[PDB]
Amino acid sequence: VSPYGPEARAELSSRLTTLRNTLAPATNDPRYLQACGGEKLNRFRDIQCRRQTAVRADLNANYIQVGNTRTIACQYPLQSQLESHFRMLAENRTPVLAVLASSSEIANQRFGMPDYFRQSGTYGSITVESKMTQQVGLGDGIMADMYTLTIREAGQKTISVPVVHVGNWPDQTAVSSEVTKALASLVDQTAETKRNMYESKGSSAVADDSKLRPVIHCRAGVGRTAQLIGAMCMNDSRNSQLSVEDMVSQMRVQRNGIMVQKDEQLDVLIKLAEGQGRPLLNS
């Protein structure tokens, strides 16, 4: 018996599959947040948002927790959702926003994915100012671009959020383990330098568990986002013993059944798992 063999992984896929089929949204499904007024909520009719963990009423976003690791996964905001997207960023006092949508995607107007973090802009009352800083090589040609978004709203405390942007991670693909672990750490490390900044400042958002969470998003927020979230979860010593099965089941139950979309992305979390002698299945 090898916990990571052909057999074992076959068992993992059965379970995980039944869960996706089971979590599929029905029409007006009560488990999922529904678009109000006819305004559009969902980037893709079928990538839905669990009502219970929903962050705001008008975004497709979710508070997620696997083990002891808390973050917020979302979809790329549609143009009309930006003033709320920034609001959530500000109120969460975001220690870091990781964006995994490639530059070709954002570039292509057909996709309607605004280039919101790479330049200055005014949305409603919220004015934003971007400023590029370092640029880090993660390996295998992958590269992260770093920015700093300053969010200003009249009458509100000005908040700046550090952005980490992996511009060349194609949609529907998995970056290797090594680039993945390399990315996860770069995200954790950025998170703490900023958490530490609010901490030495006495911000009460530190007490609060709905705040100071890493916001991550790609295109649909179930693919490239999941894989990263599964590797941040594994970087936490506290999340010990938590198998891949639970890991995948919590993301899926707290967002939708498409979390960890492709079988190759899942292979990556199975690789990291094997590398720590971490279990795949439960029991």
Side-chain angles (χ1 to χ4, degrees), residues 91-208:
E91 298 180 357
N92 166 74
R93 265 67 179 129
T94 321
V96 62
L97 166 57
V99 181
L100 318 182
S102 76
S103 297
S104 320
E105 284 161 297
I106 299 179
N108 193 340
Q109 295 319 258
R110 302 192 169 163
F111 296 159
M113 280 162 71
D115 198 359
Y116 80 87
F117 57 99
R118 290 135 130 224
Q119 28 84 175
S120 293
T122 313
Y123 313 86
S125 58
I126 305 182
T127 80
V128 168
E129 158 193 310
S130 178
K131 140 164 70 279
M132 161 153 226
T133 86
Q134 320 114 74
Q135 187 160 355
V136 190
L138 307 171
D140 204 345
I142 302 284
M143 209 85 42
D145 277 273
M146 294 189 70
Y147 302 74
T148 299
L149 287 228
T150 283
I151 306 180
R152 296 175 150 97
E153 205 186 338
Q156 303 293 117
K157 151 165 183 88
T158 307
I159 290 313
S160 55
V161 171
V163 184
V164 164
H165 174 218
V166 182
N168 52 336
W169 186 345
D171 186 0
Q172 312 259 332
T173 46
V175 284
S176 74
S177 306
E178 259 315 306
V179 184
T180 311
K181 63 142 55 60
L183 181 51
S185 318
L186 172 58
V187 176
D188 293 332
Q189 187 163 118
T190 304
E192 278 172 271
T193 303
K194 184 89 196 191
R195 243 146 194 155
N196 181 63
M197 183 285 309
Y198 286 115
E199 207 194 328
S200 70
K201 273 293 174 313
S203 172
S204 45
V206 202
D208 201 349

Side-chain angles (χ1 to χ4, degrees), residues 1 16 21 29 36 41 62-63 72 105 127 129 152 163-164 171 194 220 234-235 242 275 282:
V1 170
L16 285 180
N21 303 350
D29 193 323
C36 212
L41 174 70
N62 299 101
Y63 282 121
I72 278 164
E105 284 161 297
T127 80
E129 158 193 310
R152 296 175 150 97
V163 184
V164 164
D171 186 0
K194 184 89 196 191
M234 301 201 223
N235 254 27
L242 179 89
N282 284 161

Side-chain angles (χ1 to χ4, degrees), residues 9-73:
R9 299 172 42 126
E11 186 49 33
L12 182 62
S13 262
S14 186
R15 315 205 175 162
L16 285 180
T17 296
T18 301
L19 183 55
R20 157 117 106 211
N21 303 350
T22 279
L23 302 165
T27 319
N28 242 101
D29 193 323
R31 288 172 303 181
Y32 295 97
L33 178 61
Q34 307 289 330
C36 212
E39 199 154 359
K40 197 179 193 171
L41 174 70
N42 299 340
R43 181 138 241 145
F44 305 123
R45 257 176 299 237
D46 288 14
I47 300 300
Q48 317 233 318
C49 195
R50 198 77 179 204
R51 183 13 188 190
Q52 58 226 265
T53 47
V55 174
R56 288 183 63 109
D58 61 347
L59 300 177
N60 179 296
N62 299 101
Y63 282 121
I64 289 174
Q65 196 195 299
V66 194
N68 296 305
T69 300
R70 358 264 221 246
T71 68
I72 278 164

Side-chain angles (χ1 to χ4, degrees), residues 77-96:
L78 303 171
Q79 143 249 86
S80 60
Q81 282 164 357
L82 298 181
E83 203 178 310
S84 305
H85 190 75
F86 281 118
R87 287 241 152 69
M88 176 211 80
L89 294 184
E91 298 180 357
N92 166 74
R93 265 67 179 129
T94 321
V96 62

